[PDB]
Amino acid sequence: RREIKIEGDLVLGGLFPINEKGTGTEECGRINEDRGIQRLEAMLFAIDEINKDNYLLPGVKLGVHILDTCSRDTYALEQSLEFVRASLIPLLIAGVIGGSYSSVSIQVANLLRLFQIPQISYASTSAKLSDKSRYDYFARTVPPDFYQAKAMAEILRFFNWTYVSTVASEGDYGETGIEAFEQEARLRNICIATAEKVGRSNIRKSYDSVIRELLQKPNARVVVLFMRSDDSRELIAAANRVNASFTWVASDGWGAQESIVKGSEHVAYGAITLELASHPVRQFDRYFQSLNPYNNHRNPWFRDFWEQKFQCSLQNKRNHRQVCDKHLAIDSSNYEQESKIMFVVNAVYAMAHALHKMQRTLCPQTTKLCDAMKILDGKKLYKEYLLKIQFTAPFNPNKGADSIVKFDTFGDGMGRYNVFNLQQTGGKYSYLKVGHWAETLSLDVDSIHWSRNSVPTSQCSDPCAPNEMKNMQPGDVCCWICIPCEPYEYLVDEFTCMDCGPGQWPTADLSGCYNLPE
Amino acid sequence: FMRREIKIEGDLVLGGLFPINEKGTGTEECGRINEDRGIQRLEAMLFAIDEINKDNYLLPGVKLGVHILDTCSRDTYALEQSLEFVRASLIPLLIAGVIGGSYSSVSIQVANLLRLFQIPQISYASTSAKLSDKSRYDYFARTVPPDFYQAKAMAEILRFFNWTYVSTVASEGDYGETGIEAFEQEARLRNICIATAEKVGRSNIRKSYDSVIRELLQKPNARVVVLFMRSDDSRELIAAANRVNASFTWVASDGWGAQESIVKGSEHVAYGAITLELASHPVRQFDRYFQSLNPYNNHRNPWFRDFWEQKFQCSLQNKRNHRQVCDKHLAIDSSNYEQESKIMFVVNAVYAMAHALHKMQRTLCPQTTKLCDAMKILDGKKLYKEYLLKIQFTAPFNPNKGADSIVKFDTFGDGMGRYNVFNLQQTGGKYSYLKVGHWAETLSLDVDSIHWSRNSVPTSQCSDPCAPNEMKNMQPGDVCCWICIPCEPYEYLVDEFTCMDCGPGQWPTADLSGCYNLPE
Ligand SMILES: *[C@@H]1O[C@H](CO)[C@@H](O)[C@H](O)[C@H]1NC(C)=O
Ligand SMILES: *[C@@H]1O[C@H](CO)[C@@H](O)[C@H](O)[C@H]1NC(C)=O
Ligand SMILES: N[C@H](C(=O)O)C1[C@@H](C(=O)O)[C@@H]1C(=O)O
Ligand SMILES: N[C@H](C(=O)O)C1[C@@H](C(=O)O)[C@@H]1C(=O)O
């Protein structure tokens, strides 16, 4: 029963997948270091900054009530009940920052709307959340996968990968994400060899079984992935067991996390992944690296985090071995800012700017929470927050690279993505930015390192022999057969053989006909 | 400081929600006791549970407990209270299902909460059509029909008496608005125009209502006013009309229904009103039960005392600093109590949940009549889809079995769309409601037994009637309003809307019905 409760004049609830999904009968498992602990600290970071800022909510201290979602929608939902009992020890919640997984953000959203509690997600990308008729108190600093799916399909359409396999996570993230892709695929004449999907309480066999099925479609060497972070790790490990090798094209679920490929790097080599377009928040690196078990007591999960990151033990762990060097530290050699940290910070600041404007509007005489704001109107708040437009928390260089945080009419963020390629050049494995997507695809193909040093081929059928075969399309529009032609016929075009006619014969290259002698 | 509730343990527990108290006015959350739709309905659930707990053929071996809460007639409050039902699935009683919501707004919000934890819910009075949408309210069912039908019965009654020009007033919320929306659609199809569409709502005071009356008055021709309002709001509107002594022929939905409490203190303003209510029949055994209740033998209902003091204008030792202690011989009886119109639906709702749990226990626990391990943790999703397919004869408390006394649900989880039409009379010096018809699929009513307002069957049309002596009825663009064109002295009225030349040698009769020959 861990949580972070910090009092304040106004309190923001927070939800993070601090722990991985519990396996079997347990509800929570291992620590999610980057997407759990880091992101949690980024909200703590943002709250601290805002509490030191004399121009944003001066006179109104922001507190928090942060809870673990353990990467499970049902668990996050039960936890969230904590945010609403509040409006009846318990802290009144002005708004909630959170949900990483779309499924948890959705369920939490169905609960928070009942009590008019605004919610801002910093990572939930499902297109379902754009529906303001169902999630009317939900907003997010990231875009809907309606766009990510387009970026992925256009990438395949570029390298002409017309025959691919897809595996998607069960849940609102993977399923709706994969559906969007399928639609985008059709429109670009891309066929799906086989559509697999893993899900809830799935064990090895479920994944091993997916690898087998992918293998049963040898021609489909490129496999599209729209899977949760946890499931991705599982699928990669499975491929590693039977040493399966495909060119992976995964969504942000996998993203640019090295943790997903750890221990199966050669299997994911050459993979192409996507992640929302972002830039690290510099002041955050300083904050996070200054954290250690001695100065960070407000984060009840930090000790378990520390022990797992460094393979520790102090006096607060199970019956293990190897105590830990008091000189260990989070630093430039073992830490790298999580890709979505920026969105966590701007989500919190968005809520703050929305409360600030509301306080200036209802409390014109003081900087304090006046009686008129004693009981917040969350409906108004949400429609005082949707219209917000401000420059990304100080923590962002320039102001011309469109560093403005604001929301769509659907409460969504801008659909900008970056494309990455998992390389290893320097002995070590890393993600290199090899392109991006803003409205049209963009990537310099020369910097990409493929699997098996060769740009992958993923088509239904083998290419026809030149010397004489014509391309023949059967019933579908992806597969075909090759029909060698009569020695006296030439290829008027790729799919049609025609008689050169009397006195004539086809040219060595079969492009035309030359006259016969004798 | 003291938030009351009823907690009775059992092998299985049913949550309950009833508007025991009226909406609180101003800063307070709850107000006066709602006697009929509050206390009665509450006790009808306690009644049903007792009977079930004595029935050896229904849930024998499994005692039903309850967790009944007050909604104070407010969705937000009902919502906060319901949280109690979900925390339970984590002192607290585990909820197998919830019986409740009277007002649609509370049933809807509660349904939005309960579905998240797959807790089945059966409402005994919420009629909003929205609730038929199993894509949003997938854990909700009800023993009553959607107003999709009630609105049709109302529009067909107007179309009958040719009331083509009417005003409407709807309560803000899912009951009044969706209800009035259905009527508006039904009206158009039957060529009925709406003079003015008013609507009262949340935190509304006198002026909001007085203002509605004034606007109704600004449409004198529309003498018939259609109402689709909550009980509480209805009472306000009628009180408002009573102040400026405004008089219209009211056609109200079940919200008003056949409650005498709505008209009390303004009976002459509501005289001749026509109201609808769901077709039901009193549950005889309940009369006996409710009548045997008194502050001495009914300690399990923590609201009964307040109830008592208000019904009789009492005081004992558990009340404010008032006067007049109360006669220890008072008693609820045939002279001061009449079964609330929807009691039958509360009993059936509760019985439906029991039958659903009963069938599930017989299925999952084949060796005993006890709640076996297999059912220690109920699968609410299954319960709901074991409960939707339920079909049984109305709790013993219903005579015959041929008048279709079978409780079941639509594919939408709704009940059957059958209504009764009532007329507010006063013949015997006292005001009362008289059944003057009913609606099953087609309207039906014997016009002769109806007592109208101002002893004359109302006229509710757009334009003033044409002068006889020479005017012809003329229809412009719509089918509700018209203009009257006096005719030439040499024209007669071949028909109400047509003037024709009598032709040479002839001249129209004083009456204008024909032409007579000219002398000279
Ligand atoms: C097939 O893909 C290659 C690789 O980008 C490209 O050069 C070529 O133009 C494409 N051909 C088709 C079918 O458009
Ligand atoms: C309604 O109008 C019809 C047709 O004009 C008429 O026959 C009927 O009597 C009217 N209904 C009543 C009873 O007012
Ligand atoms: N975009 C993911 C989702 O909406 O579910 C979210 C990823 C993240 O936390 O960055 C998590 C996921 O892997 O699904
Ligand atoms: N049928 C009403 C509704 O759906 O809201 C319900 C009436 C009742 O409790 O009998 C209450 C109301 O007044 O609206």
From Swiss-Prot, chain A:
Gene Ontology molecular function: calcium channel regulator activity; group II metabotropic glutamate receptor activity; scaffold protein binding
Protein species of origin: Rattus norvegicus
Residue numbers on the Extracellular membrane side: 1-518
Keyword Ribonucleoprotein assigned: no
Keyword Transmembrane helix: yes
Family statement drawn from the similarity comment of this UniProt entry: Belongs to the G-protein coupled receptor 3 family.
Keywords (A to Z) from UniProt: Cell membrane, Disulfide bond, G-protein coupled receptor, Glycoprotein, Membrane, Receptor, Signal, Transducer, Transmembrane, Transmembrane helix
Membrane topology: Multi-pass membrane protein
Superkingdom field: Eukaryota
Any one Gene Ontology cellular component term annotated for this protein: astrocyte projection
Tissue expr: Is widely distributed in the CNS. Predominant expression is seen in the neuronal cells of the cerebral cortex, dentate gyrus, and glial cells throughout brain regions.
Subcellular location field: Cell membrane
S-S pairs: C28-C70, C191-C478, C312-C324, C363-C370, C460-C479, C464-C482, C485-C497, C500-C513
Subunit annotation: Interacts with TAMALIN.
GO process annotations (BP): cellular response to stress; G protein-coupled glutamate receptor signaling pathway; gene expression; modulation of chemical synaptic transmission; postsynaptic modulation of chemical synaptic transmission; regulation of synaptic transmission, glutamatergic; sensory perception of pain
Residues annotated to bind L-glutamate: R39, S102, A123, S124, T125, Y173, D252, K340
Role this protein plays: G-protein coupled receptor for glutamate. Ligand binding causes a conformation change that triggers signaling via guanine nucleotide-binding proteins (G proteins) and modulates the activity of down-stream effectors. Signaling inhibits adenylate cyclase activity.
Principal location: membrane
Residues listed as glycosylation sites in the UniProt record: N160, N243, Q365, Q390
Protein name according to UniProt: Metabotropic glutamate receptor 3
